[PDB]
């Protein structure tokens, strides 16, 4: 999920905002 998307791979706004409420 997030760690694979944003830590081990390069993250994006698009993906970060999927974790906003």
User: How far is it, in rounded angstroms, from Cα 20 to Cα 11?
Assistant: 15
User: Smallest distance, Å, CB 18 to another protein?
Assistant: 9
User: Smallest distance, Å, CB 6 to another protein?
Assistant: 5
Produce one character per residue of 1-21: b if its CB has 16 or more CB atoms within 10 Å, e if not: eeeebeeeeeeeeeeeeeeee
Residue numbers 1-21 binding another protein by CB under 8 A: 1-3, 6-13, 16-17, 19-21
Residues near another protein (CB under 8 A): 1-3, 6-13, 16-17, 19-21
């Amino acid at each position: 999920g997030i760690v694979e998307q944003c830590c081990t791979s390069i993250c994006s706004l698009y993906q970060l905002e999927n974790y906003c409420n």
